[PDB]
Design a protein around this ligand. Sequence first.
Ligand code: NA
Lengths: 218, 222, 222, 223, 219
Amino acid sequence: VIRYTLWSVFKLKDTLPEDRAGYADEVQELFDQLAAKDVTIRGTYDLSGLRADADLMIWWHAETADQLQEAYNLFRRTKLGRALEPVWSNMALHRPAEFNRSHIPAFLADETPRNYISVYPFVRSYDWYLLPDEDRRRMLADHVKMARGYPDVRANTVASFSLGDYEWILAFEADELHRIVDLMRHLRGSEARRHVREEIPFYTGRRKDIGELVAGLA
Amino acid sequence: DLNEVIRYTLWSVFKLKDTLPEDRAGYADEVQELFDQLAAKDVTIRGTYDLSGLRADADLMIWWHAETADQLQEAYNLFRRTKLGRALEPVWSNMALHRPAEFNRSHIPAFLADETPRNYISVYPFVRSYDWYLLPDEDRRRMLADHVKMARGYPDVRANTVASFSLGDYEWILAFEADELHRIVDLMRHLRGSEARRHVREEIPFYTGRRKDIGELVAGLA
Amino acid sequence: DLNEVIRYTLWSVFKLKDTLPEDRAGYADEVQELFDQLAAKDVTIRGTYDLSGLRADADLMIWWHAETADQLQEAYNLFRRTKLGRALEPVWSNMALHRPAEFNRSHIPAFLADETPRNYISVYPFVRSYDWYLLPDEDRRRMLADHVKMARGYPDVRANTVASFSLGDYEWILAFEADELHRIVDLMRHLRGSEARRHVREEIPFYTGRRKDIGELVAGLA
Amino acid sequence: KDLNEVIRYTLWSVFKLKDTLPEDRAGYADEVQELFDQLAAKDVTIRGTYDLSGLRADADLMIWWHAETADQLQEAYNLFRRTKLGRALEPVWSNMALHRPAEFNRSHIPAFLADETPRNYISVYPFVRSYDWYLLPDEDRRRMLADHVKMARGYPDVRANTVASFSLGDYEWILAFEADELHRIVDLMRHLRGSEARRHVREEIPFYTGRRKDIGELVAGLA
Amino acid sequence: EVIRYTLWSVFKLKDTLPEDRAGYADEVQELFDQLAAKDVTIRGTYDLSGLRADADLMIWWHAETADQLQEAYNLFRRTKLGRALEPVWSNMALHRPAEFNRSHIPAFLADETPRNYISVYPFVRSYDWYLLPDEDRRRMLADHVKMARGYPDVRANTVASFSLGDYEWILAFEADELHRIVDLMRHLRGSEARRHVREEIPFYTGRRKDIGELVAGLA
Ligand code: NA
């Protein structure tokens, strides 16, 4: 029913120490104690190279915003956290859909998280929500029909009104990176594209467990 | 009346330079002593709010109000001299002032009414379209009326709407309070169906967080 | 009297690097000493203003004017060498030049009419729409005249409208002065009803604060 | 036919000096050349290293590299950041793109994929089209893009690399133009302002324009 | 048919210069002399301080190739003065023949003398400006030149910069009286070409100074 989800992006302050021995195990220990507290770490992602101002993303969710705030601060006390600068951190809340109330975010359907993710915020035009419900229904229905040829890339569209600067946070997961690219380009032919004001920054990266992630960062 | 009282309100947003020390003993105590010293029947502290996690560039917000802007400036600088203030970077600090409404003159912001602050807050500046204030009065009145109607189902969400022309970059500062955070998001989504949404130029940044006494706030920050 | 006389105006905004030392002994004295020397060269400091709290990224403004831009540049650099100057970071510094008005050539900025500085200021730059200067002269005259008409309910708010084309990013710098801050807010709100509001492109950042002696200003900063 | 059917990711990574390189920088270029040699032994291609200094204030060096997976380029990026030169630099702008078949002319293959040799000057910039461009009748897009390559015909010495980047970053395409005469890029871009497709543009900044150099000469000439 | 690249490089102080700065201007002047022996011309150094919070110094230099100006820029950044500065904005342009009035070239290529004051800014036209019928553009540019004929003492430098940076043109106006640049710019707001502008910021305006005087005047 009520599930908050948070995507927290970090950049390296400079590089990690040449010997970073306890770094990944301290974080893994924290992740283990948070799961005990009903905070789910859906994934950590390597963003480096694909963005100059970002290296790491944590995707976590829980029943209250407050538990995600605590996890965020606990992570920052970590040795890895203390080597990182926060860049972008945005929360969303799963609410019922306007028209098709079967659409549940992948993370909420206990679906396996895929190898690649592309996360971006979203803001519609000023008049989108003022259109006749009939018009908003048709365009969203088209939106899912054209997506139907990409069932291998899983959608996570969550409301974020009033939690930050946006209206929705979107997160697409797929095991092949080029499938997110092709879907995104295909969805440019949707007529809902006439009703967009903002959809950046894009944070795109590779799911890794924390040991390998720490090892591959500069 | 209470529309002829002058009361300035300030929202001051800060970010940790890094993290607080492992040993932060007197940190929250020093700030509390400042607060009731400030409260010496003059500068009111409506709340301190934990914003961390909900945005990367902010960690705490102070909401204070007083009879003059000068008192709020002094309070601001005094806070920056505390140990906690010296661990923080200012991020966004905007002042506003209750001015009598154009139409419904008994909408008073909750803070000037002395109502109890709620668990969660969402504050953002607001700038209307260039011709909103040029519209026929009844057009504006109807849209604002349609807008009040669209909120009828959220009496639990308290709205502060306060004029800020020429005090900073904006026209209004808005602050919504509620005990359940999900009610603020639902109200916001619902209000997207209001006809006044066609007369908006700016409405960010959003600063949203959990009201906490300074003790637990200092303890939970990185 | 003199529209043909040349007077450059500069508003220089600074931000604390961190916090002033607790012993800030000769900080204000060095700056006052500098200001008295500048006055000897007919570089006049109209005011120093406390911006802190009303803005997170600014703490102090200096308003100075002189017969040449060169003299104001020299004063700025001299200020930056004082102890107080080395504790600040420049934020926004913008020059303007009095140029005779288009129609109401009897419009003189308050700083050129020997009006004494008021206790509060609100300073912002201004950029008109692209076609404003392309409208028939009479449509521009009417809008400028009506805007003058709406502003006569606020004779206690003194205007300083000065051209800045090609000295920086803007077309005008504006500075309003009043002994009561809430009257600047109300004027700005009232002028939103002016038809010229359909011909605006940019009017931020706003820098608003309290005029203060440099000694009291140095004392009250963090 | 298996030209656009392969998968080749390409990355342009831009860095700024933190301040200045040391006067004694004896091993700096050598370490990087070593890494580039090692990476070539991994099928990561360094198409070029470019000196961007002076042409903008916020950038000094660009690396253009491509490989079969995004992952390989991520690894290379981080390896470069560990070198002595990499540690004297600040990341500025790093964007990835992936060759996909063009909508109308599948005979448009980016120069680096047609394995043309790198020219002396490069101009790199991202691109975002208007909201309605992808909604237009397929005829209009066909016509305006045909209009576009026809006007580009007077500049065959300027080689084009237009690569899709949807959901890899903030943009829709990354473009890179290469020529041995910098002024020919300027004249091409000016001439292309007369194209009907210019009515369907939302973003095309930052431009990173610079001179291709061997890493030894690059390092010796940086401040 | 000549190729001349022109670069405007803007810097700001990291903090202030040392109270004792005896070798700073000398060293830079030596570099300028060494560059003159490679036909890299320094048209001027300009004091921007005070008119801009985030800029203190501009160098205007031009050479036959972009590469020479890169070398010069990096050489400057190695001087003691260069080490006390942060790069802010550095943009190159290239003189290309005009679409209509081929009789107009920038002042610096006509080798006339640099004036006391400069105002430099980039320029980007509307998307449809280059799409208008040639006669509409020709009329608007012609009338705009007519509006500027009352200011012969303000010298214009309009130089193409497509694909060298974020802009389409770099403009630089030189005059011995600063108020005449203000008045011309105000006057030209009544030109119909103002309907075809997308960007014209930042403005960097300052006072031409010899490097010795400029180093001594900076905070
Ligand atoms: Na990127």
